[PDB]
UniProtKB/Swiss-Prot annotation, chain A:
The keyword Glycoprotein does not apply. It comes from Arabidopsis thaliana (Mouse-ear cress). Pathway: Isoprenoid biosynthesis; farnesyl diphosphate biosynthesis; farnesyl diphosphate from geranyl diphosphate and isopentenyl diphosphate: step 1/1; Isoprenoid biosynthesis; geranyl diphosphate biosynthesis; geranyl diphosphate from dimethylallyl diphosphate and isopentenyl diphosphate: step 1/1; Isoprenoid biosynthesis; geranylgeranyl diphosphate biosynthesis; geranylgeranyl diphosphate from farnesyl diphosphate and isopentenyl diphosphate: step 1/1. GO terms for biological process: carotenoid biosynthetic process; farnesyl diphosphate biosynthetic process; geranyl diphosphate biosynthetic process; geranylgeranyl diphosphate biosynthetic process. One of its GO terms (molecular function) is dimethylallyltranstransferase activity. It catalyses: isopentenyl diphosphate + dimethylallyl diphosphate = (2E)-geranyl diphosphate + diphosphate; isopentenyl diphosphate + (2E)-geranyl diphosphate = (2E,6E)-farnesyl diphosphate + diphosphate; isopentenyl diphosphate + (2E,6E)-farnesyl diphosphate = (2E,6E,10E)-geranylgeranyl diphosphate + diphosphate. Catalyzes the trans-addition of the three molecules of IPP onto DMAPP to form geranylgeranyl pyrophosphate. Binds 2 Mg(2+) ions per subunit. This is Geranylgeranyl pyrophosphate synthase 10, mitochondrial. One of its GO terms (cellular component) is mitochondrion. Its EC number is 2.5.1.-, 2.5.1.1, 2.5.1.29, 2.5.1.10. It is found in: Mitochondrion. NCBIfam families: FPPsyn. It comes from the Eukaryota.
Curated annotation (Swiss-Prot), chain B:
Pathway: Isoprenoid biosynthesis; farnesyl diphosphate biosynthesis; farnesyl diphosphate from geranyl diphosphate and isopentenyl diphosphate: step 1/1; Isoprenoid biosynthesis; geranyl diphosphate biosynthesis; geranyl diphosphate from dimethylallyl diphosphate and isopentenyl diphosphate: step 1/1; Isoprenoid biosynthesis; geranylgeranyl diphosphate biosynthesis; geranylgeranyl diphosphate from farnesyl diphosphate and isopentenyl diphosphate: step 1/1. Its cofactor is Mg(2+). It comes from Arabidopsis thaliana. Binds 2 Mg(2+) ions per subunit. It catalyses: isopentenyl diphosphate + dimethylallyl diphosphate = (2E)-geranyl diphosphate + diphosphate; isopentenyl diphosphate + (2E)-geranyl diphosphate = (2E,6E)-farnesyl diphosphate + diphosphate; isopentenyl diphosphate + (2E,6E)-farnesyl diphosphate = (2E,6E,10E)-geranylgeranyl diphosphate + diphosphate. This is Geranylgeranyl pyrophosphate synthase 10, mitochondrial. InterPro entries: Isoprenoid_synthase_dom_sf, Polyprenyl_synt, Polyprenyl_synt_CS, Prenyl_diphosphate_synthase. Isopentenyl diphosphate binds at residues 46, 49, 78, 97. Dimethylallyl diphosphate binds at residues 96, 176-177, 214, 222. Monomer. One of its GO terms (cellular component) is chloroplast. PANTHER family: FARNESYL DIPHOSPHATE SYNTHASE, GERANYLGERANYL PYROPHOSPHATE SYNTHASE 10, MITOCHONDRIAL.
Amino acid sequence: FKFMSYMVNKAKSVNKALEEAVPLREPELKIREAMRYTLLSDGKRVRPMLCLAACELVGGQESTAMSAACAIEMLHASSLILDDLPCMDNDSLRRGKPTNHIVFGESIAILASQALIALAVQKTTSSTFADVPPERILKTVQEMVKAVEGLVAGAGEGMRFDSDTGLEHLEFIHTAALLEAAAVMGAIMGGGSDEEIERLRSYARCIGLMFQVVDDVLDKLTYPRLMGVEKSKEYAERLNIEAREHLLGFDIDKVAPLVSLADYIVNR
Amino acid sequence: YDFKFMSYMVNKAKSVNKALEEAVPLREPELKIREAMRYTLLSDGKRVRPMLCLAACELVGGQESTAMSAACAIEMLHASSLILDDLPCMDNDSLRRGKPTNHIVFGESIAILASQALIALAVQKTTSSTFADVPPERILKTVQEMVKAVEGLVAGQQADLAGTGLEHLEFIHIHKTAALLEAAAVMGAIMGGGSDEEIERLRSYARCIGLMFQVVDDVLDKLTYPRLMGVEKSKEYAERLNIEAREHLLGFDIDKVAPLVSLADYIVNR
């Protein structure tokens, strides 16, 4: 389907706004090259793509959220430069053959991740575009830095014995902030009502969660074995239903792309 | 040794510290990540940058009230970068001032997390300012000033890693050491109501005083300043810096500028 199309187009459209955000120049230069090595590899720009979406959805236009969108992907890149560190997951190679720190060193990787965190902010914060009331960018950056916090953050509590019979029901409790951010920033920039902004953050959570439920199905703690694939799957579809619910309120003519995104997730 | 100033510098420091402590409470969760940030952040300073921020507010006719979130921010960012530079990957320093560093108490994994939470909280706290008795238009200018600071730090941390009159040390120093100082001055200047020119005069002052710290410390003694110079010619650089700094303050109210002059005084009189 074309949802892939258009989906593909946004991604190409984004990839170009990205390559100009971070060009080649001497000062400083490698940090800029390290930035691109991770930032401009092939990836589904889901996060930025969702930003533009949320913007168009609330009655704005794609280019206004473009630099919000560009930053939310910058934060993404800053994070997994850091996640692939030995201190953290220590994934020697992911997607790319080597990871950033394996090519450039831990020192240079870490630095690059910071340059990228500064840059993202500068861009959303680069005052810009539609000359959206600056009162508004604030909330945008706010929500985007609010993101990096819950990103750092990323059981028990309950127990019962039926006795009818040997039941012993035990309950537990248990990220994807960049996704919510993307959604929210975009809705902000495109001129969103407080309540549309929150509808969209609810949505972003649901599809955030059903991404990894679905990916785990494709295979310490996983999402398999606990419960069941038959179970994990239904879970994911229940989420897809909720995501639809949060889309209720918006004009019917514009929710198509987010309805479709949702479905693209679980339909694998 | 000057009192009143110290009295100044101290009461001011206490105000900031109280402001910091409450900005980062010990509440769960990430308990040992709020714990890791607090360890470095709440550790005793040396709260010049926040002072300078606050001073620069008052000088351009603002209240200490207005620039406190900003003052916290810059000291947070100081912390965040400080944690990062200590990392084995980078300067590799187990101890600082007799106590041991963040990552030898919490491990590299948490240290890094703590610095990221700090740089994220730093930014947040400029924008998230009450007393919005002030237009949001130059809260934004404040934020970009903190951005530049961060690029300066990166720039500078990166140059530090390059193990005859070469003197790029000045570049290193400005970029890392002086940047936060300049950010302090300016972010405070901005919040206060300052003209774009009052601001740059402060930015220059902040830079002279920046330089002048590192020149004098080197002296009260892997290239350092007195060696490429010779012990003395460093010591006039200081006072040349010292004067230049003072020049930059000419034009201001000769009352409200007392601390910034006195600050310069203090430093070179070592």
